[PDB]
Amino acid sequence: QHPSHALLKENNFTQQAYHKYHSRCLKERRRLGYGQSQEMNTLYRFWSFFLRENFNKSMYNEFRSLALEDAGNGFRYGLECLFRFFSYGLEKKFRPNIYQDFQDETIADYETGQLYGLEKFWAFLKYYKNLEVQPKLAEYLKSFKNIE
């Protein structure tokens, strides 16, 4: 199996294995450029699912930073995986710092003219079974009410 799947198997994550896998992913990105590495893409998906229960400040900051570099040049997959992590990760374990970040990246995504992040935020607030919202995102969400 591919490391992106084997490292998600229950109780099988190892540091030694993640380091080898992580390594070639960055080399492949550093070799082929933003949004051009299918191997790097497997790492975005691994991060998206892994951190939902398997959180790591180290991995999360990297995930976020690279996803935003890519998306700043038009390649959306990494950022799409990050919003999916935000929406489903916070449903499984609410972290206030990560909720604030979710707001921050949703606002930034909307103001670049996208709706993928805002819908994911709307989806979270709706299903999150239990929130204060930056009044700017508050108004953006009110206008989204005409869509979903």
UniProtKB/Swiss-Prot annotation:
Disruption phenotype: Mutant males show multiple meiotic phenotypes such as a failure of chromosome segregation, cytokinesis and mitochondrial partition. Defects in spindle pole organization and spindle formation. Mutant-derived syncytial embryos show a range of mitotic phenotypes, including failure of centrosomes to migrate around the nuclear envelope, detachment of centrosomes from spindle poles, the formation of multipolar spindle arrays and cytokinetic defects.
Superkingdom of origin organism: Eukaryota
Places the protein is found: Mitochondrion; Cytoplasm, Cytosol
TM helices/strands, residue ranges: none
PTM comment, free text: Phosphorylated on threonine and serine residues.
Oligomeric and partner information: Interacts with pAbp.
Protein name: La-related protein 1
Gene: larp
